[PDB]
Design a binder for this molecule. Sequence first.
Ligand SMILES: Nc1ncnc2c1ncn2[C@@H]1O[C@H](COP(=O)(O)OP(=O)(O)NP(=O)(O)O)[C@@H](O)[C@H]1O
Ligand SMILES: [Mg+2]
Ligand SMILES: [Mg+2]
Ligand SMILES: [Mg+2]
Length: 311
Amino acid sequence: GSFTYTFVVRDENSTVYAEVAKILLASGQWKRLKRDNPKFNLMLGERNRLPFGRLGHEPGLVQLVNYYRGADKLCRKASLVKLIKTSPELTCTWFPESYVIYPTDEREEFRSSFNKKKENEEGNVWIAKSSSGILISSDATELLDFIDNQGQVHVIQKYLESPLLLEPGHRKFDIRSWVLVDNQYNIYLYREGVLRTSSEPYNEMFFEEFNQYLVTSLNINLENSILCQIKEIIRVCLSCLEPAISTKYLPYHSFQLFGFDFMVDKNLKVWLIEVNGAPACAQKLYAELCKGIVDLAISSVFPLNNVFIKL
Ligand SMILES: Nc1ncnc2c1ncn2[C@@H]1O[C@H](COP(=O)(O)OP(=O)(O)NP(=O)(O)O)[C@@H](O)[C@H]1O
Ligand SMILES: [Mg+2]
Ligand SMILES: [Mg+2]
Ligand SMILES: [Mg+2]
């Protein structure tokens, strides 16, 4: 329809959306405006503290923003924990046992869990992390100190003592998928992940080789084990969040890119450890990705004249 849409960029430092800001121009149908110009169709907003209250007011403007208000209820450690312990649906065998500790909480239920394991004489190594410096120990009282020492509401999570290692180099790793949730709440998983292998033994590795280390050194395949369970976790996590961030009755549209962080243990079991709301990408994939975003979440709303899986 030879029409030209408009957009503002409120986050100059996002490499994922500094990229998108381009691919748009590439279609010859988009024009970037002044960061403060309110006549935009699409707003590539800021990582945190985004002005959602001013969306869908400008007369006649249908607006889309690249963040779901309230999506931090899944992205912040402490929140993610409450969310899984709240909704009855969350059968969460894939989520490390976790407790929120306020410096000044669940440190009482934590101690109970800790002591129970101590008497049953089983793995009792935990890791204390900050919701937004990490400690890994077996001493509760000590872990709790660390928390109180530096006020910042930490989370005490059960540490995976039996992690699937790699080689050469026998190093620990973690996988990270990219999930795109559009304005109608369709979920799309980019066919490519990325691993963050460790330097010292127990570099960034892609699904290219890793799909091999699962066969040329193991039994099953990349799909028949990991990629299978990963989909289930994504689906339930976002399904439990929908009610609290659905834009069905809001005066504007919303879409968002999430970066899920997983881990695999000895028995090839996949655990969820974190979900990042403003994930960057590999310098390599930054292209086939940012184009799926425009295709699936932007152009789907503002029409112009495989790679993704729909969970
Ligand atoms: N439950 C767990 N069991 C085993 N290892 C874990 C667990 N949780 C986290 N880790 C490891 O701890 C590392 C850092 O934890 P993470 O929760 O990602 O912290 P962060 O605050 O986002 N910081 P960053 O190190 O920049 O990613 C991860 O890359 C994992 O290798
Ligand atoms: Mg929103
Ligand atoms: Mg996004
Ligand atoms: Mg992290």
